[PDB]
Amino acid sequence: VNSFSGYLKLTDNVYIKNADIVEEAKKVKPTVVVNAANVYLKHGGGVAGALNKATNNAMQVESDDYIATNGPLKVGGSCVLSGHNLAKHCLHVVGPNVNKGEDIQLLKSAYENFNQHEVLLAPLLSAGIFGADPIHSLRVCVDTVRTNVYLAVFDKNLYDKLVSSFL
Ligand SMILES: Cc1nnc(CNc2nc(Cl)cnc2N)n1C1CC1
């Protein structure tokens, strides 16, 4: 039993809710919140911008030190950093950004990072300002992630479409 509330069950291990991931993280304080990161960990907008703002920019400060030491992430890759006031840990995962021309096949590699964590609160990777079809992202999630994932979808209209079209 865990503390996630109000989710619709899609599969054995994938759950979905219309929610603001920031507000959901603040209430649940999950072990892991996933950030929709880019390779530079520049958290300017979308989910990343929202999460970083909620940490009062502490996420960005930590991220800048990470990059200065380690260099950029790979598209499809990830790193574990602090969850600050939102979670124990933040798993920064880089899905391909279609608006930069990155290969959508890398979306499966991106979701594979979730399998290193037993339970996660997450957005749909490569959705929103990353330009991919969220219906496709949900399908890849369900077909790739085997650990327990709680998906937060900000947009109510999109949430309803994802549920109604789910096979
Ligand atoms: C549309 C849409 N609906 N949900 C998402 C991603 N998930 C979340 N993003 C935020 Cl900013 C807050 N809370 C979330 N759960 N998107 C993408 C970024 C454009």
- Resolution in Å, one decimal place: 1.0
131, 121, 108, 117: which is closest to 153 by C-alpha? 121
The CATH fold assigned to 8-165 is: Leucine Aminopeptidase, subunit E; domain 1 (3.40.220)
List the residue whose alpha carbon is closest to atom 9 of ligand 1.
47
Q: Using CB atoms within 10 A of its CB, is residue 127 exposed (0-12), middle (13-18) or buried (19+)?
A: buried
What is the whole-number distance in angstroms between the Cα of residue 48 and the centre of ligand 1?
A: 9
String of DSSP letters for 26-78? HHH--SEEEEE--TT----SHHHHHHHHHTTTHHHHHHHHHHHHH-PPPTT-E
Q: What is the per-residue burial (b if ≥16 Cβ within 10 Å, else e) of 87-98?
A: bebbbbbbbbbb
Whole-angstrom CA distances from 140 to 59, 111, 115, 126, 161 are 28, 8, 13, 11, 16
Q: How far apart are CA 8 and CA 95, in angstroms?
A: 24
Amino acid symbol at 110: A
Domain chopping of the chain, boundaries: 8-165
- Which ligand 1 atom is nearest residue 127's CA? 17
Q: How far apart are CA 97 and CA 126, in angstroms?
A: 6
Q: Are 46 and 59 in contact (CB under 8 A)?
A: no
